[PDB]
Amino acid sequence: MNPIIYTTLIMTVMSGTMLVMISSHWLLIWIGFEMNLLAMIPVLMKNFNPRATEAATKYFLTQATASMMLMMAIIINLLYSGQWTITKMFNPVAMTMMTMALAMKLGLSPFHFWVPEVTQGISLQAGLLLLTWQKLAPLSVLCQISQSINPNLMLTMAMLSILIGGWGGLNQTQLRKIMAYSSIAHMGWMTAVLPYNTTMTILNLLIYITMTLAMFMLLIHSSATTTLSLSHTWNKMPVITSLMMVTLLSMGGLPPLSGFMPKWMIIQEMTKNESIIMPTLMAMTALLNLYFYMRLAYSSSLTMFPSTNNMKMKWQFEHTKQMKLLPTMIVLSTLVLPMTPALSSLN
Amino acid sequence: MTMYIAFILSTIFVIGFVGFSSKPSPIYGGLGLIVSGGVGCGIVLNFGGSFLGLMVFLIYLGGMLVVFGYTTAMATEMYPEVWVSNKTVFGAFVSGLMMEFCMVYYALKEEEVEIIFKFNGLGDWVIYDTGDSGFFSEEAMGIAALYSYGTWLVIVTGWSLLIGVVVIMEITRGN
Amino acid sequence: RQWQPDVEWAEQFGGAVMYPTKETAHWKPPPWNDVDPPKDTLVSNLTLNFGPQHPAAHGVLRLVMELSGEMV
Amino acid sequence: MMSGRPGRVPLQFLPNEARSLPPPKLTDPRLVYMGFLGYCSGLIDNAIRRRPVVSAGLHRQLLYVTSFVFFGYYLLKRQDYMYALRDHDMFAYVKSHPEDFPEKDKKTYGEILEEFHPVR
Amino acid sequence: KTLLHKYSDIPEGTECHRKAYASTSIGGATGLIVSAYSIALKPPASFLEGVARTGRYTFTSAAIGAIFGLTSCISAQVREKPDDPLNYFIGGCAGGLTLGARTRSYGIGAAACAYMGLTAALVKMGQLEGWQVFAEPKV
Amino acid sequence: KFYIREPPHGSPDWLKVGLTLGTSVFLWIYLIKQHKEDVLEYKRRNGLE
Amino acid sequence: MPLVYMNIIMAFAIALAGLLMYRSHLMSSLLCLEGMMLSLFIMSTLIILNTHFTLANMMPIILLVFAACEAALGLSLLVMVSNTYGTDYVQNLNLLQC
Amino acid sequence: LLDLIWLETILPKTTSFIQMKMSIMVSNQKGLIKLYFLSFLITIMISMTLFNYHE
Amino acid sequence: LQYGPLAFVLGERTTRKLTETSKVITVDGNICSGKGRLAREIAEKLGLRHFPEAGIHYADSTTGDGKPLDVQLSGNCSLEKFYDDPKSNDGNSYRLQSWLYASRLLQYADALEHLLSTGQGVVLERSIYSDFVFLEAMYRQGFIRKQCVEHYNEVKKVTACEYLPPHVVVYVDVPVPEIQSRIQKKGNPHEMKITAAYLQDIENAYKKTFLPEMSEKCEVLQYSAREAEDAEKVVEDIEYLKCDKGPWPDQDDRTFHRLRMLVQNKLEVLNYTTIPVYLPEITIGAHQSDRVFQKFTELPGRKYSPGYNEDVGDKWIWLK
Amino acid sequence: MNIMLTLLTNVTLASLLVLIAFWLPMKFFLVAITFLLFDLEIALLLPLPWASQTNNLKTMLTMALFLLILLAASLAYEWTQKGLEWAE
Ligand SMILES: CCCCCCCCCCCCCCCCCC(=O)OC[C@H](COP(=O)(O)OCCN)OC(=O)CCCCCCCCCCCCCCCCC
Ligand SMILES: CCCCCCCCCCCCCCCCCC(=O)OC[C@H](COP(=O)(O)OCCN)OC(=O)CCCCCCCCCCCCCCCCC
Ligand SMILES: CCCCCCCCCCCCCCCCCC(=O)O[C@@H](COC(=O)CCCCCCCCCCCCCCC)COP(=O)(O)OC[C@H](O)CO
Ligand SMILES: Nc1nc2c(ncn2[C@@H]2O[C@H](COP(=O)(O)OP(=O)(O)OP(=O)(O)O)[C@@H](O)[C@H]2O)c(=O)[nH]1
């Protein structure tokens, strides 16, 4: 795009979510969700390729429909209390309505089939924006109305994300598809802890955000979208693959890496809430995520893969993009476990 | 009769939705919404709300829906299905008929319909309030606050529409 | 020397899915440039038949010409 | 949880009550950890950009260490304030609700009959 | 959850007919849900194949519920154990064996026995105890 | 010289680097100053002063 | 509660079913999505006018001016899948199988 | 018979086979919006009626 | 400042620099047809930027100190060996051709960068749109087999797609027997024992594919050697043509900014050259590739980023 | 009622005299979408007449004129980036 015109589209959506996290009025929250969608569509179709045209259509139809379902959740609450402020909802079906409506905007439960296809069609740079920033807007509302949430309603949504995210992730080939499924699996973790204490929901969000940028911008540097294409990068840029491995271990969740940050506190939090069978399933099924993390780890750096003659030409030229914030993002996503008591700052 | 006129219109409103919810030919589906759009204003009109109702005619029925069917006109295949055509379309229509008949029958006999929302089945008119409005229309004086109280609304809705104008070109540019 | 993966090991990862299945046995790999292949032309250049109906053609002036809706 | 306790001036990274806490000493083990992370950021920054790791633009390393320590130091103040705030309002509720936290009675182990299960 | 309430209200072992009808109702309802998804995400050729998929899935699920409720109840009062988890353990394998015959594979039948037998004991395990799967946010 | 083209980072960007030390010393001196007033304020408010 | 509101409430539901079920054409789906905000508009105006919530008259006008922005985006996307695929049938939109 | 035939096929291989089959089920979709949205309608219906969350 | 998007906003627009003399003229032809000679004459006549034929060691000339590296370290393919025996089991046939196509791709990119930046017209022999004639000749003559063709044209699809065809292409069509008439005089041992059919297969693949697949996108004007010495005529036709029927004289400034985004990122234009498709003749094994990379790394200058190698005398490394 | 009676009578007259006449004997899209966005922006300032009589019309002056310059701004961006010069 024209650099100045892509800039405003990048940050009209920055402001769209910014409205949601600051609006105290129900209508205004929908307003920010509208600008969220209205600015997301062009970015997904920066390159104008039939994958993007499909990805935009699938993304738009899903988000628009969820937005409409959100409105009548707003109307029903108005119909039964006449209150436009955001507080605990004053009617059950309205509460049930927006939980599904907000879920589809985020996408954890069966409302998740759009997530893989949309990111697969669109470019990697727009992939991180969809998988990182487009999740704060739905989560901000959920953390706001967590008091009125239905404990049964959310938790079954939470597992169905991690089980689906855990299972289907094994069979995926395209790195964007794997990243999307891990995002679905990660999405389940904080949504499950959302009814109990939203501090860990935000804590899981921040850590997951840090891990995803480290994942996406490294892949952008690799200029690769397939496992085999990522496999070749061992020879040209061995350092990146080594960093690819450490963030994969981190975002797998193994201690003392920062992936043990959210789970451990989340496991601890629900255990204080007498829910003990619930954490065990999520912790155990989290290994499904680790398997295709291992699969990517094996093919990236741990075992070198066959290369091509033409890539000797690649060594002759240096990189151009400075991939801003990459060094600090990696370190902030690997060795922050000893700073765990910093979670008290959020609350 | 005349007491149930809002109910009568509301009934046509529902069956009007079945017209386009059944997903017929896009032109014919638009027409089914056009009547549905038309009657819905009358429901609003009977409750007051002249200006809010009039928009449904102007900027939606004569507005959004005009370019809607206009797009269906130059798009779509050379063989537009006539409402009967596919048996599913008529199956959907009769399906919509049985939902409104069962509730309305249930509404006017037992008056204790509890489907999702518990709603008691009385006439439309037992909900209106009382009191004189002086010399100012409540609807007119409410949305006239767009420029006296609608501060943050105008700033945001105006900004998005400008982004609406830029997003539509960027998608339609073709790179 | 230490054993390293070979092409047969690599082609195992090279399928459209890690785990083959007859449903996905025909899913072709995505284009590397992410560019799906264009289809053929989808043009609507109708060749208008001016002439022997319109006084606009002043009479017997059959014209054959194609246009992009308006541009001849 | 916090969230909306009495007195919650929003977007206040350091409420005035935090000034009544012992400030984090510059030699804090937590604080120097922020410095260590800054160094690791500097090493990665040179590593990613094909630079001679340690001896490669030490000015960038200084900026990374300074930013991490400074951003760290304000974090511990908020970290200690909220942690102290959690216990402060805690220590007053028990006083206001004494019957909600009844005190146990002195019973030495000489009277407590803990069952002795033999082990074989 | 009135449908789930039926199984809980009837005492274990006693009123085997009521337990069997309630248990197969739970299985049949579950079979409806999965079959409805199966047609949705993976459509069959026509409607006749659609009901064919529903017929198989519902019959399997209803059979598992019927055999589990029957075996669990008939084992309870026969053994005079209205609390032992074993009363559900052989119930899980009863469904496990029932599934194995439904898809005609010995290996999947043994695995279903082992997995359902464990879970059925585990589901019973929480019934005597205070185990909660959807515990309310006390803290 | 090796490289035919003068390289992007071959010439030290003296304006940029001197700025970074400028922030580094500014960031430190504020940190030192911040700790003293915090210590003094805690010394005063909590009754020890 | 008056039957005119339940008439509106199903109107959302029948519109909701049409949007989700799909038959062939994205035009119909876009039409179904418009009945969504339509039935929302009468429902919003009906409650707000009944309760004399004067400032709340804001929302009806604000509701559809932003709902119409969906049409500005939704209609545009359709023509592009119409330009490339031909007919805008949802069945054509299956390239992103993986 | 015991070590690497049965003990290796009860815990490790059976779990791997179960995950493999389920991973096939979840990943193998059709990419059709009609089928995806139909699933959404069912989920909406079960949630509002059959999951009993409303009650 | 570089062409980072900030520079576009506060200034530089590509369209300002472009003038009439901003073509991408390529002078193609058969072997030893004077296409390099004719391209030099045309470029110096119009004062354009002539680019010599992209050889196996052209990439080395574009980086480092312009010193051709060792053949194993800079392509693992010798053209002379291919002329000596193309059917060699080492796969020198397709390996040389595939690397040459990448060399042309890098050559084409540098010409595009100079044209977009300076605005001066560029000239280069052959093209990335014309290297297919050799492999198609290399196919019908049995030098390669089907798998090499599939990889090459797929690389053409994934690389040449975002490279529009030049304004005008010059084709000097010397007859094949006449090319034979000069090659005995040339006396380069490898290129003597060419197959007459192969050079015949150079000519026809040039004939009904090059111009026809280039005519619809650009003007194709054709001569022979007798007009190569007569370059004063081959240049006035360039003056006469309007540069019509070409996708260059319609693009706006937005596309040019996008084009400069691609070209200035050298690895980006090379990213789709190294497709993970594993052709046996070009796939370097893990151990050999690792050793070769270690050989590349120990080379002076290549150890670190440009301007960051104290081995070559880069002072102030501690404060770069 | 009177309104319903008027429209009903008009339809019958049109219907009656129709019956006696039957038994007795991207550019195209762009103009649509640009109108749609302008029309929606037009509906914002329709309540202007009564809004002109608000007790804080100074704030009305800044913001009623706001929408009007945005109408110009939307057209201005449309005009400069081709836009109203439709594809031809
Ligand atoms: C938590 C558990 C552990 C988690 C992390 C595990 C990481 C490894 C796991 C396996 C990774 C995959 C297999 C190996 C991949 C290797 C990747 C790679 O790029 O290797 C080759 C590469 C060659 O090195 P090169 O880039 O040329 O740089 C040399 C130094 N200039 O090598 C490199 O580029 C590596 C360069 C390393 C530079 C190290 C610099 C050390 C500096 C020490 C400073 C000490 C200061 C002390 C101060 C004391 C007083 C305060
Ligand atoms: C005391 C109270 C309870 C009393 C009754 C006992 C419990 C209820 C009955 C048993 C429920 C669990 C057993 C599974 C039931 C569903 C079986 C089913 O769907 O079978 C069809 C199919 C398996 O065959 P397939 O892989 O399709 O291969 C053939 C293809 N032509 O299925 C599949 O392919 C998909 C895999 C099965 C469906 C998903 C999982 C369904 C079960 C989830 C847990 C249900 C728990 C119910 C009880 C507690 C809650 C009320
Ligand atoms: C590879 C599979 C596993 C291999 C073997 C691992 C070890 C086997 C047992 C696994 C134990 C996991 C759960 C233990 C976590 C701590 C539980 C604990 O401390 O005991 C509680 C036991 O309570 C539980 O219910 C804990 C879970 C019991 C088992 C059910 C879940 C675990 C089994 C299924 C998941 C793991 C198996 C793999 C599935 C794919 C006590 O709480 P309570 O019930 O007394 O609470 C007070 C009151 O009574 C209210 O309940
Ligand atoms: N195998 C192979 N050789 C190529 C390819 N492109 C160019 N060459 C070789 O490039 C060399 C130089 O081209 P020639 O035409 O012989 O060069 P020249 O003798 O200077 O003559 P002119 O090009 O007419 O100036 C020849 O040995 C060609 O075979 C290719 O795609 N494959």
Side-chain angles (χ1 to χ4, degrees), chain A residues 299-316:
Chain A
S299 78
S300 319
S301 72
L302 268 288
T303 79
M304 324 146 276
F305 255 59
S307 82
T308 68
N309 39 357
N310 315 296
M311 158 164 138
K312 306 182 261 272
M313 209 195 219
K314 281 283 215 332
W315 316 332
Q316 297 175 268

PDB file of all heavy atoms in Angstrom, chain A residues 299-316:
ATOM      1  N   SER A 299      13.133 -30.375  12.977  1.00  0.00           N
ATOM      2  CA  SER A 299      13.424 -30.056  11.585  1.00  0.00           C
ATOM      3  C   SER A 299      14.119 -28.711  11.419  1.00  0.00           C
ATOM      4  O   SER A 299      14.616 -28.422  10.326  1.00  0.00           O
ATOM      5  CB  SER A 299      12.133 -30.068  10.767  1.00  0.00           C
ATOM      6  OG  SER A 299      11.393 -28.880  10.976  1.00  0.00           O
ATOM      7  N   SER A 300      14.174 -27.888  12.464  1.00  0.00           N
ATOM      8  CA  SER A 300      14.721 -26.542  12.321  1.00  0.00           C
ATOM      9  C   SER A 300      16.210 -26.485  12.657  1.00  0.00           C
ATOM     10  O   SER A 300      17.030 -26.132  11.805  1.00  0.00           O
ATOM     11  CB  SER A 300      13.939 -25.561  13.202  1.00  0.00           C
ATOM     12  OG  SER A 300      12.551 -25.833  13.159  1.00  0.00           O
ATOM     13  N   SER A 301      16.569 -26.831  13.884  1.00  0.00           N
ATOM     14  CA  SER A 301      17.943 -26.630  14.332  1.00  0.00           C
ATOM     15  C   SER A 301      18.587 -27.878  14.915  1.00  0.00           C
ATOM     16  O   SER A 301      19.794 -28.069  14.744  1.00  0.00           O
ATOM     17  CB  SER A 301      17.990 -25.501  15.371  1.00  0.00           C
ATOM     18  OG  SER A 301      17.433 -25.926  16.601  1.00  0.00           O
ATOM     19  N   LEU A 302      17.821 -28.726  15.606  1.00  0.00           N
ATOM     20  CA  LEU A 302      18.422 -29.872  16.281  1.00  0.00           C
ATOM     21  C   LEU A 302      19.058 -30.831  15.285  1.00  0.00           C
ATOM     22  O   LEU A 302      20.135 -31.380  15.542  1.00  0.00           O
ATOM     23  CB  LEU A 302      17.382 -30.600  17.130  1.00  0.00           C
ATOM     24  CG  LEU A 302      17.288 -30.156  18.589  1.00  0.00           C
ATOM     25  CD1 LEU A 302      18.498 -30.648  19.354  1.00  0.00           C
ATOM     26  CD2 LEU A 302      17.170 -28.658  18.709  1.00  0.00           C
ATOM     27  N   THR A 303      18.403 -31.058  14.152  1.00  0.00           N
ATOM     28  CA  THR A 303      18.960 -31.856  13.068  1.00  0.00           C
ATOM     29  C   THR A 303      18.932 -31.019  11.802  1.00  0.00           C
ATOM     30  O   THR A 303      17.864 -30.561  11.383  1.00  0.00           O
ATOM     31  CB  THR A 303      18.174 -33.152  12.867  1.00  0.00           C
ATOM     32  OG1 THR A 303      16.981 -32.874  12.125  1.00  0.00           O
ATOM     33  CG2 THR A 303      17.798 -33.755  14.202  1.00  0.00           C
ATOM     34  N   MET A 304      20.096 -30.823  11.193  1.00  0.00           N
ATOM     35  CA  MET A 304      20.134 -30.064   9.957  1.00  0.00           C
ATOM     36  C   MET A 304      19.525 -30.870   8.812  1.00  0.00           C
ATOM     37  O   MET A 304      19.575 -32.102   8.779  1.00  0.00           O
ATOM     38  CB  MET A 304      21.564 -29.638   9.624  1.00  0.00           C
ATOM     39  CG  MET A 304      22.417 -29.279  10.831  1.00  0.00           C
ATOM     40  SD  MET A 304      24.152 -29.724  10.642  1.00  0.00           S
ATOM     41  CE  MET A 304      24.134 -31.434  11.145  1.00  0.00           C
ATOM     42  N   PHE A 305      18.945 -30.146   7.865  1.00  0.00           N
ATOM     43  CA  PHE A 305      18.193 -30.698   6.753  1.00  0.00           C
ATOM     44  C   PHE A 305      18.919 -30.415   5.444  1.00  0.00           C
ATOM     45  O   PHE A 305      19.749 -29.501   5.373  1.00  0.00           O
ATOM     46  CB  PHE A 305      16.781 -30.093   6.707  1.00  0.00           C
ATOM     47  CG  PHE A 305      15.705 -31.022   7.193  1.00  0.00           C
ATOM     48  CD1 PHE A 305      15.740 -31.535   8.477  1.00  0.00           C
ATOM     49  CD2 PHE A 305      14.650 -31.369   6.367  1.00  0.00           C
ATOM     50  CE1 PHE A 305      14.746 -32.385   8.924  1.00  0.00           C
ATOM     51  CE2 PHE A 305      13.654 -32.216   6.810  1.00  0.00           C
ATOM     52  CZ  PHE A 305      13.702 -32.725   8.089  1.00  0.00           C
ATOM     53  N   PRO A 306      18.650 -31.192   4.395  1.00  0.00           N
ATOM     54  CA  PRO A 306      19.303 -30.935   3.107  1.00  0.00           C
ATOM     55  C   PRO A 306      18.994 -29.537   2.595  1.00  0.00           C
ATOM     56  O   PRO A 306      17.876 -29.037   2.734  1.00  0.00           O
ATOM     57  CB  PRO A 306      18.717 -32.012   2.188  1.00  0.00           C
ATOM     58  CG  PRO A 306      18.248 -33.084   3.104  1.00  0.00           C
ATOM     59  CD  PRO A 306      17.804 -32.397   4.355  1.00  0.00           C
ATOM     60  N   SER A 307      20.000 -28.908   2.000  1.00  0.00           N
ATOM     61  CA  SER A 307      19.888 -27.567   1.451  1.00  0.00           C
ATOM     62  C   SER A 307      20.021 -27.621  -0.068  1.00  0.00           C
ATOM     63  O   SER A 307      20.128 -28.691  -0.674  1.00  0.00           O
ATOM     64  CB  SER A 307      20.942 -26.644   2.066  1.00  0.00           C
ATOM     65  OG  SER A 307      22.193 -26.798   1.422  1.00  0.00           O
ATOM     66  N   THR A 308      20.013 -26.443  -0.685  1.00  0.00           N
ATOM     67  CA  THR A 308      20.107 -26.316  -2.130  1.00  0.00           C
ATOM     68  C   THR A 308      21.345 -25.512  -2.506  1.00  0.00           C
ATOM     69  O   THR A 308      21.827 -24.674  -1.740  1.00  0.00           O
ATOM     70  CB  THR A 308      18.859 -25.650  -2.717  1.00  0.00           C
ATOM     71  OG1 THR A 308      18.810 -24.278  -2.308  1.00  0.00           O
ATOM     72  CG2 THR A 308      17.602 -26.361  -2.242  1.00  0.00           C
ATOM     73  N   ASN A 309      21.849 -25.781  -3.712  1.00  0.00           N
ATOM     74  CA  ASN A 309      23.056 -25.111  -4.184  1.00  0.00           C
ATOM     75  C   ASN A 309      22.843 -23.609  -4.314  1.00  0.00           C
ATOM     76  O   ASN A 309      23.738 -22.818  -3.995  1.00  0.00           O
ATOM     77  CB  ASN A 309      23.483 -25.697  -5.526  1.00  0.00           C
ATOM     78  CG  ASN A 309      22.302 -26.009  -6.415  1.00  0.00           C
ATOM     79  OD1 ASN A 309      21.150 -25.834  -6.019  1.00  0.00           O
ATOM     80  ND2 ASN A 309      22.579 -26.459  -7.627  1.00  0.00           N
ATOM     81  N   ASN A 310      21.664 -23.197  -4.785  1.00  0.00           N
ATOM     82  CA  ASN A 310      21.408 -21.784  -5.036  1.00  0.00           C
ATOM     83  C   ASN A 310      21.504 -20.943  -3.772  1.00  0.00           C
ATOM     84  O   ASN A 310      21.664 -19.723  -3.864  1.00  0.00           O
ATOM     85  CB  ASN A 310      20.027 -21.600  -5.667  1.00  0.00           C
ATOM     86  CG  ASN A 310      19.759 -22.593  -6.777  1.00  0.00           C
ATOM     87  OD1 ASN A 310      20.438 -22.594  -7.802  1.00  0.00           O
ATOM     88  ND2 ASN A 310      18.755 -23.441  -6.582  1.00  0.00           N
ATOM     89  N   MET A 311      21.408 -21.562  -2.597  1.00  0.00           N
ATOM     90  CA  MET A 311      21.383 -20.792  -1.363  1.00  0.00           C
ATOM     91  C   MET A 311      22.791 -20.414  -0.905  1.00  0.00           C
ATOM     92  O   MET A 311      22.941 -19.620   0.031  1.00  0.00           O
ATOM     93  CB  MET A 311      20.583 -21.584  -0.323  1.00  0.00           C
ATOM     94  CG  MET A 311      20.817 -21.294   1.136  1.00  0.00           C
ATOM     95  SD  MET A 311      19.453 -21.992   2.079  1.00  0.00           S
ATOM     96  CE  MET A 311      20.336 -22.703   3.450  1.00  0.00           C
ATOM     97  N   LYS A 312      23.828 -20.927  -1.573  1.00  0.00           N
ATOM     98  CA  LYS A 312      25.152 -20.331  -1.423  1.00  0.00           C
ATOM     99  C   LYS A 312      25.131 -18.872  -1.860  1.00  0.00           C
ATOM    100  O   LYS A 312      25.867 -18.039  -1.318  1.00  0.00           O
ATOM    101  CB  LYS A 312      26.189 -21.107  -2.234  1.00  0.00           C
ATOM    102  CG  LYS A 312      26.242 -22.598  -1.961  1.00  0.00           C
ATOM    103  CD  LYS A 312      27.335 -23.252  -2.796  1.00  0.00           C
ATOM    104  CE  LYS A 312      26.772 -23.902  -4.047  1.00  0.00           C
ATOM    105  NZ  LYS A 312      26.351 -25.306  -3.795  1.00  0.00           N
ATOM    106  N   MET A 313      24.298 -18.551  -2.852  1.00  0.00           N
ATOM    107  CA  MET A 313      24.096 -17.162  -3.245  1.00  0.00           C
ATOM    108  C   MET A 313      23.482 -16.348  -2.115  1.00  0.00           C
ATOM    109  O   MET A 313      23.776 -15.154  -1.981  1.00  0.00           O
ATOM    110  CB  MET A 313      23.207 -17.104  -4.487  1.00  0.00           C
ATOM    111  CG  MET A 313      23.440 -15.917  -5.398  1.00  0.00           C
ATOM    112  SD  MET A 313      22.074 -15.731  -6.560  1.00  0.00           S
ATOM    113  CE  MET A 313      22.948 -15.249  -8.041  1.00  0.00           C
ATOM    114  N   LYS A 314      22.632 -16.973  -1.299  1.00  0.00           N
ATOM    115  CA  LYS A 314      22.003 -16.263  -0.190  1.00  0.00           C
ATOM    116  C   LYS A 314      23.040 -15.780   0.816  1.00  0.00           C
ATOM    117  O   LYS A 314      22.897 -14.697   1.394  1.00  0.00           O
ATOM    118  CB  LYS A 314      20.977 -17.163   0.497  1.00  0.00           C
ATOM    119  CG  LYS A 314      19.649 -17.269  -0.226  1.00  0.00           C
ATOM    120  CD  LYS A 314      18.803 -16.027  -0.014  1.00  0.00           C
ATOM    121  CE  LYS A 314      17.328 -16.381   0.064  1.00  0.00           C
ATOM    122  NZ  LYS A 314      17.014 -17.617  -0.706  1.00  0.00           N
ATOM    123  N   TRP A 315      24.089 -16.575   1.043  1.00  0.00           N
ATOM    124  CA  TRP A 315      25.118 -16.186   2.000  1.00  0.00           C
ATOM    125  C   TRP A 315      25.839 -14.916   1.569  1.00  0.00           C
ATOM    126  O   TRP A 315      26.357 -14.181   2.418  1.00  0.00           O
ATOM    127  CB  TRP A 315      26.133 -17.314   2.185  1.00  0.00           C
ATOM    128  CG  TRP A 315      25.546 -18.686   2.317  1.00  0.00           C
ATOM    129  CD1 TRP A 315      24.314 -19.013   2.802  1.00  0.00           C
ATOM    130  CD2 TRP A 315      26.183 -19.922   1.974  1.00  0.00           C
ATOM    131  NE1 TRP A 315      24.141 -20.375   2.772  1.00  0.00           N
ATOM    132  CE2 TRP A 315      25.275 -20.956   2.268  1.00  0.00           C
ATOM    133  CE3 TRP A 315      27.433 -20.252   1.442  1.00  0.00           C
ATOM    134  CZ2 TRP A 315      25.577 -22.297   2.050  1.00  0.00           C
ATOM    135  CZ3 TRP A 315      27.730 -21.584   1.226  1.00  0.00           C
ATOM    136  CH2 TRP A 315      26.806 -22.590   1.530  1.00  0.00           C
ATOM    137  N   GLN A 316      25.883 -14.643   0.266  1.00  0.00           N
ATOM    138  CA  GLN A 316      26.641 -13.512  -0.252  1.00  0.00           C
ATOM    139  C   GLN A 316      26.015 -12.164   0.077  1.00  0.00           C
ATOM    140  O   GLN A 316      26.675 -11.137  -0.112  1.00  0.00           O
ATOM    141  CB  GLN A 316      26.803 -13.646  -1.766  1.00  0.00           C
ATOM    142  CG  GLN A 316      27.600 -14.862  -2.199  1.00  0.00           C
ATOM    143  CD  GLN A 316      27.630 -15.033  -3.704  1.00  0.00           C
ATOM    144  OE1 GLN A 316      26.792 -15.728  -4.278  1.00  0.00           O
ATOM    145  NE2 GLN A 316      28.596 -14.395  -4.353  1.00  0.00           N
TER     146      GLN A 316
END
